[PDB]
Amino acid sequence: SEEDEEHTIITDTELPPLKLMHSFCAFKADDGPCKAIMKRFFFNIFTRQCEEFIYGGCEGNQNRFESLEECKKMCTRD
């Protein structure tokens, strides 16, 4: 489990490697510091699926989408 974008990055297991559209698709899902309960989606590089998480409403990172489809578009090829 290593992925690359333009320059490359490694982590700890084995399934044929992903050239990620954008680097942020491999960032951990981040709730941020605010306390709301917002259902959002992010790309999980280990299951290779877009998955649900709870966003607090502020800050965080780019691996965060309002829909399954919006997430596919950014973090999945064609």
Added chain:
Amino acid sequence: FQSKPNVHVDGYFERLAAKL
């Protein structure tokens, strides 16, 4: 970056806890 079985930031589940 995500690491094997750690796809969320530190304290995600503990903070989530408290919200729900």
